[PDB]
Each structure stands twice: as structure tokens, then as C-alpha cells.
């Protein structure tokens, strides 16, 4: 699924919180479908399956809150494409297209 693939690329990372570097990834064409050096993005430190599970009971395009918490790195406030980095554990709010996550809405419950 195209939308799912884009979501995984843009928001899911197999990197650890410590090894993750916003300055690197926010400017890495391999993980920036909507373009590099964007103002803000949140990365989910997890295997893809648990994230897809968030949409297991969703029908149509609808926002869903995850029932489990994930480790999240948010890259923001760039200055010449160099970012401030923050990490938190929280639930996430995403838009599902049936069983596929397609858009990251916000950190925490919807
Ligand atoms: C990504 O770039 C930012 C901005 O250069 C780094 O944060 C700065 O780090 C220096 C030390 O190297 C500090 O003196 C500045 O005060 C920091 N600025 C901000 C806005 O925090 C950030 O550490 C870099 N990311 C990584 C993983 O090294």
C-alpha cells in the first residue's frame, strides 16, 4: 500500500533513541518523502507491526488513538536545517485508511 509505505518511511524508525539524529534523518532523502529540512516531524521507535495494529478495527479514513504507548522522537525548530530534539513515551493519534496507518496527526490521544 502506497500511503502505508510513505507513513513507514516518514515516521517509523528501527534506530534507538540514542543513535537517532534529527540533523541526519530530517535531511536524509531516504526518509523524507515530503522533502528534506521540514519544520517538524515525529519518529516512532518501533517495529512496524505494532504501529499497523493501531488500525486493526478501523473502517474508512478515520483517526485512531493507539492503546499502547511508544517511544517517540520529535524533531523541530530548525535553524538552517539543524533541529531541537525531544524524546517522550506516549500514545499517538494517527489517521487510518481501513487497516493501514496513513497519516501522523499528533503525539498522545486524539
Ligand atoms: C543537531 O543540531 C543542533 C543545532 O546545532 C544541535 O544542538 C546544538 O548543540 C550544540 C552543541 O553541539 C549546543 O551548543 C547548542 O546549544 C544546541 N542547540 C540547540 C537548538 O539545542 C543538536 O545537538 C544536533 N543533534 C545532534 C544529535 O547532535
Q: Overview of this structure, please?
A:
The PDB classes it as hydrolase. The entry lists the keywords cytotoxic RNase, enzyme efficiency. The assembly is monomeric. The entry is titled "Enzymatic and Structural Characterisation of Amphinase, a Novel Cytotoxic Ribonuclease from Rana pipiens Oocytes". The protein: Amphinase-2. The organism is Rana pipiens. The protein has 110 residues and is an alpha+beta fold. The protein has a single domain, classed as Ribonuclease A-like domain (P-30 Protein). 17% of the residues lie in helices and 41% in strands. The strands form two sheets. The chain has a four-stranded mixed sheet with strand order 1-2-4-5. A three-stranded antiparallel sheet has the order 3-6-7. Strand 4 and strand 5 form a beta hairpin. The chain is globular and about 40 Å long. It starts with a helix and ends with a strand. The chain binds a molecule of 2 linked components (NAG-NAG).
CATH class: Alpha Beta
- Identify the strand order in the major beta sheet: 1-2-4-5
Question: Please, what is the CATH homologous superfamily?
Answer: Ribonuclease A-like domain
Number of helices: 3
Structural class: alpha+beta
* Span between termini: 24 Å
% residues in beta strands: 35-45%
Shape: globular
CATH topology: P-30 Protein
Order of helices and strands: HEHEHEEEEE
Count the domains: 1
**Rg over CA atoms:** 13 Å
Bound molecules: a molecule of 2 linked components (NAG-NAG)
Please summarize the sheet with the most strands.
4 strands, mixed
Instruction: Estimate the helix proportion, in percent.
Output: 10-25%
Number of strands: 7
Instruction: Supply the CATH architecture.
Output: Roll
Amino acid at each position: 500500500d502506497r500511503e502505508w509505505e510513505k507513513f513507514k518511511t516518514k515516521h517509523i524508525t528501527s534506530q534507538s533513541v540514542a543513535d537517532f539524529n534529527c540533523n541526519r534523518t530530517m535531511n536524509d532523502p531516504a526518509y523524507t518523502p515530503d522533502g528534506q529540512c521540514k519544520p517538524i516531524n515525529t519518529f516512532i521507535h518501533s517495529t512496524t507491526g505494532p504501529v499497523k495494529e493501531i488500525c486493526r478495527r478501523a473502517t474508512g479514513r478515520v483517526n485512531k488513538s493507539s492503546t499502547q504507548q511508544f517511544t517517540l522522537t520529535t524533531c523541530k525548530n530548525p535553524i538552517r536545517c539543524k533541529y531541537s530534539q525531544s524524546n517522550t513515551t506516549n500514545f499517538i493519534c494517527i489517521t487510518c485508511r481501513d487497516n493501514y496507518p496513513v497519516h501522523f496527526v499528533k503525539t498522545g490521544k486524539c
